[PDB]
Amino acid sequence: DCRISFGMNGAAPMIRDETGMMVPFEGNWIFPLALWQMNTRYFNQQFDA
Amino acid sequence: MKRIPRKTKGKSPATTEPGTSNREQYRARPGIASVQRATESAELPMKNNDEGTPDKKGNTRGDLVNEHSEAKDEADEATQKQAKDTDKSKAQVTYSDTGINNANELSRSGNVDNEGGSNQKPMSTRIAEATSAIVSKHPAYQCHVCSAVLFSPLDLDAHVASHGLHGNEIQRHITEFISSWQNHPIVQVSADVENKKTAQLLHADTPRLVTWDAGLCTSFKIVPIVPAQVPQDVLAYTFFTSSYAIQSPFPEAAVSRIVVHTRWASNVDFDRDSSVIMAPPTENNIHLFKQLLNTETLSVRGANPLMFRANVLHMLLEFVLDNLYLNRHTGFSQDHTPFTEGANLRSLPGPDAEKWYSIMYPTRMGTPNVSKICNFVASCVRNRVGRFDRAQMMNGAMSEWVDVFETSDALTVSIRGRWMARLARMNINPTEIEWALTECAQGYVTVTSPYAPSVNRLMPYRISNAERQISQIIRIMNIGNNATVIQPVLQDISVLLQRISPLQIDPTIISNTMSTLSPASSILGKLRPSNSDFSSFRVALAGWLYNGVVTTVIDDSSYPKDGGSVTSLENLWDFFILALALPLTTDPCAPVKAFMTLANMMVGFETIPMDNQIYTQSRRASAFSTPHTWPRCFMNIQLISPIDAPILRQWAEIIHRYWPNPSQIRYGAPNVFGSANLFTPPEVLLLPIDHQPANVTTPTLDFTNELTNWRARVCELMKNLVDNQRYQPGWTQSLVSSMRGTLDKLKLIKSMTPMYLQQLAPVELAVIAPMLPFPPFQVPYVRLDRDRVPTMVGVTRQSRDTITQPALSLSTTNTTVGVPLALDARAITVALLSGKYPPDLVTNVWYADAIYPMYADTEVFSNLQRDMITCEAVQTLVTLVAQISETQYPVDRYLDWIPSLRASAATAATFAEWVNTSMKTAFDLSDMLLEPLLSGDPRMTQLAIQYQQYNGRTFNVIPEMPGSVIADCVQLTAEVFNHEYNLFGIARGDIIIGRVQSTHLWSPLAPPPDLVFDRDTPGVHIFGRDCRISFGMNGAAPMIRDETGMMVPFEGNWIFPLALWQMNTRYFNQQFDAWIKTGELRIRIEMGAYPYMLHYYDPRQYANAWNLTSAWLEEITPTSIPSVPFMVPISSDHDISSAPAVQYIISTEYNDRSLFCTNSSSPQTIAGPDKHIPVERYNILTNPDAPPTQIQLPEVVDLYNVVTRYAYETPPITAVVMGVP
Amino acid sequence: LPGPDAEKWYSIMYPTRMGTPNVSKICNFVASCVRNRVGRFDRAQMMNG
């Protein structure tokens, strides 16, 4: 169910947890390869930086 | 101002981001192109079916062909195009020469009218000839919101607008989709554009709901009838060295009247082009009341009274349609003119905005002189002008909405008020879209529609299921047994399905398993693996969706020649191929046929008992097409003797015990998109197969799978049959060994088709349904439950509380439940026998790639909007038509005083056609809408649809029709018409023809009491149809016959209903004229309502109106009746001499209401009609105790009120599709 | 009726349709007839269209 909600007015963008918690782009995450594969472009764009 | 052209004809610092590098190493599977083209053709809406309906002239369109013949020819046309679509000379799937005997089937043809007559001679021609016998003559970049990549900084601001973020994409965009796993965005644009550059299309014939008007919200304008210029004490305003001129709010002239002229001061983006323009009363407006049924007229000028109400109603309809706009908010200017000091006047767009102020705000002009105009201005309150209240929310320094005082008319305002509401109620918010699209996908992808916070983001797409049902009943009626209309839907879908499906059909599988009299070779030559056409398979599936209008069956040709016989090797194979394929047809009689087929071949070996002393055991199988033919021994196996017919008995048990079992599946998103399901629950999609959870690891030989088992069971049966060779003498060598293995090979063949048909197939169908242009229409699938088998589907037009002529819908002339479609048993079996998936299949990926491009071209949203109108249309129609014919529909009748005949079906029909086309051109529609309802007595009450079971029970579905803005508005304005009728060029009451020579100056439209008389007056004589006249002999006076039966002489006061004159124009003109002119005869013509025309004259000069009143009488006809001419005196602001005036026509009640003001620029009117600016009309200005928001409808139309003006955002639908692991 | 030169029939067909301005032997007859018995009287419409 992971999705991403863009940031606004300076706030940070956030991606959805697996329990439904929404975190900012920082810390230690765990991604099953498949999950990235099914979203390569969108992810590379949002996270690489 | 902007402008949207019509598609129809009208009434006329490093910035290099770390992840933006392209490594497009992905190739979609299925391919994007492939899927697009495919769905591109499914998108297409079914063809309009004019044939059978009437045109504006009243003549029905089409060719003069028998209903039965048309049905057949159309069938051929279809099956023949089916061929061209599959690039073959002979069609595999046919809509003609099916086993079914559809001998009673009827199609709409232009051979019949609305009264059940023959169009051998056109309706117009009949009407003409019919009246021609009654005539008489005179005697001798990058976006972190959605991740889309851009190239211009401007292209960014321009773009982000789609998310709500404002300018810190081209409106041409309607749909902006974007995938997350690949770089390939997809946007939809209107098909009417000229630059389909890499853009996808939105074909749907969508109506233009949102429209704007930056002009004035008024539909009445004040005009000068008789000019005038008078000397004044004050000539202008002066400031230091500057000097400004005096601009009045109203015309400065001797006489001014009000006139209807929709949007005379409007400034729009889109032109509904349905204007109602009237001319000043001094000119002829007769044309406004003869646009309709006044076709076969004997005079250019003059309308037909019996068609008055009919015409007037239509007019009111356009009056509404032409005003369906939203009021746009334009800017203002802070004014410092002494009289409107500090007010914020709204400035119209364009040049000379200050030119309009004078007209928008009466109070602006001071009170310079002593004139009727000023006396008014003096009366108004200063404080109510300009901006009154504004929104708290704002973008930039501009408010999102505002309330302002300004010239306008309560009616028009009130209308746009409701139009507003209606749309607003249809609002949706992206979050809802997320849920909808996501749910539709059955969980293979997930949509995300980002957006910023806003309340003025209008997205009208939500409606009630009821509405969708009503709408789809219209669709079902459109088909009308014309294969041509369906042919495409079915085909075009089977294609989509083909390239969206991971299943592949590879006959070689059969070839490799057989490895080769030879039973082995026979079956091969019978199947023909080399042939790669499988339309029958795909179509077969598409059929499961429209099982209520189309019924698939196996072509009679697929059965055994001459019945067949278990002794012929070839026939046994026919049986196989057949039995194996029947289950995929919607034909509710498949089972029985699957049984009888073998029973046929068994003749001479086994025998079953027949219940009928007529039909034998040889009755060809393909003939058991309906439920009443199911043989008793088929429903009660117990009746088949295991001694007399051992095999048939098993075949029977096998059918009962193993024939597939129907089931259902959820589909679509019923909470946002609603559902057009009619006979089934909203979220259900019926299937004639059992469905299971998807799982590619599934075994090929899973006898748990209903279909796989059938394959088996049918094989082992044959085996048993062929084992002892008791059923095949004349077979020289033992073929058991071979015949067996051959069957064994088929039984155990590793086809994955059944697997697919039970796991993926169902999903795919569900993933489509919602996006389809013609939503599913099913009727329950019951297997062997005979009593519950459906056999008829019909539509009804009248309400349940009435007994009318039973007019069954053509839909019911089909032997089956629907139009027969024939499929090829061979093809289907082969397909079932040789399917396989790609070895590297991965559902999660495959379907993701299959949905993205397909959903990105979705037209759901637009179809929803249409469904909304389609309903409003129907609703409106019944409301109107019911006011000119005798229907039992409950509605307030406000215009019953306007004469009208009792419309016949034929008459009503043509009326409808206008009510029809007017709506289409108003909403820029170019396709169907109501057409189907105009095929026979449209004098309806309510739509409803139903189907019956073999046991006689029926299911009736009557959608709960909700409100209708259009309908109500028409009625609202009609309610107002009942008072402001003069403003529309219509006069109420009767008239009185009679000489009146005097010098007085009263208006003939407002006569003095003792010049008018009525039925309940002394010494009056009333007349009827029997008004025989007798000539005077030898000096005696001629005499006409009373209503009492008395012969009276040509003098006194009579009462004639208009009709009389019309029936005897020539004779009466001859006998009476002389008496009326110089004698003492005065006639009151009863009319009810009538158009009038004014002739102003100089009071101080002789004037004799005989000429006009003569010509009026002269030109009356059994059909026409020119505008009544009145001769009125020109009012004057000063003493004048008097002079005789001879009149002959006066009204019988006040009708000078359109009179706005006399000598407006002068201090007072000395002679003639004196009228002062109608204070009532300017209530919120002339009455201090009145709240700003008060209206006086429906008795008085205020010409100045509070108007709410908005500014909304209409963004495209954005969707970011993500994949699932 | 079919065929050209038909306008003639509509007057021989229905006498109750004529106007009655005269005191002519004809008008007298016409004038004394019941109005409502002319034209279509009743029908059996089974199939819509």
Ligand SMILES: [Zn+2]
């Ligand atoms: Zn974006």
